[PDB]
Design a protein around this nucleic acid. Structure first.
Length: 89
RNA sequence: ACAUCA
């Protein structure tokens, strides 16, 4: 998970407070340019917000997406992007 | 802040 892992594990993206509702296949069609995706899925909370999760074959190539998609927002607009599974930092 | 099950 966190800290200097030294190879192994698999990197992912998390997006939350997402616009309307995404299909996992539609966001795969965008993320695939940063590297091959192994799995993706979508979720929701009883608070009414929605989430999506997108796996990647290498962390540092996918990080160019995570850093341009950065800056979460609230209390007037819905969008959030974060990487808890920040492998090879 | 939050999931993976393929």
């Amino acid at each position: 998970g966190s800290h200097m892992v030294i190879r192994e594990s698999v990197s992912r993206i998390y997006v939350g407070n997402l616009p309307s509702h995404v299909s996992s296949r539609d966001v795969e069609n965008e993320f695939r340019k940063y590297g091959n995706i192994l799995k993706c899925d979508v979720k929701k909370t009883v608070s009414g917000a929605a989430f999506a999760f997108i796996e990647f074959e290498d962390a540092r190539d996918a990080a160019d997406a995570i850093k341009e998609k950065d800056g979460c927002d609230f209390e007037g607009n819905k969008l959030r992007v974060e990487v808890p599974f920040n492998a090879r930092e």
